Design a protein around this ligand. Structure first.
Ligand SMILES: O=c1cc(O)ccn1Cc1ccc(Cl)c(Oc2ccccc2)c1
Length: 133
């Protein structure tokens, strides 16, 4: 019942500072422009210990499946090959990606009827808000 309030289908409704976050991460111009236009669906499901997070958009479709605390190799939408670990910390899903001596963290939290996604790269934070679809 660990992630019950995350399960479902969520649609992006607002984004702030995502271009700057992507710049900090090293995403190139053309990918930033097309990625930043996207209005993804985030689909979260759980089956036993396995959590699946899908992102569906006109830009890319991605899917990760994982067990909390158990590292996995991930190819990100911007084609980084990263080692990821996702944990639950105080009811927040915390997703750390490591590559090339760098690290970024994506936090997903339930707040009122929204799912709020905060992406941090060094001093740059972006906040993305999703609503139930
Ligand atoms: O998977 C998520 C969901 C978010 O809201 C924010 C970051 N991340 C991770 C993330 C990482 C890099 C890029 Cl380029 C990215 O761009 C998109 C944009 C739209 C659709 C798919 C990928 C999303």
């Amino acid at each position: 019942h660990m992630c019950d309030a995350f399960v479902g289908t969520w649609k992006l409704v607002s984004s702030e500072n995502f271009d700057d976050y992507m710049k900090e991460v090293g995403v190139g111009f053309a990918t930033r422009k097309v990625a930043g236009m996207a209005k993804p669906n985030m689909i979260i499901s759980v089956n036993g210990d396995v959590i699946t997070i899908k992102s569906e958009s006109t830009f890319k479709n991605t899917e990760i499946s994982f067990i909390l605390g158990q590292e996995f190799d991930e190819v990100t939408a911007d084609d980084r090959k990263v080692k990821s670990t996702i944990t639950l910390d105080g009811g927040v899903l915390v997703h750390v990606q490591k590559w090339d001596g760098k690290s970024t963290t994506i936090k997903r939290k339930r707040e009122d009827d929204k799912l709020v996604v905060e992406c941090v790269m060094k001093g740059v934070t972006s906040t993305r808000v999703y609503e139930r679809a």
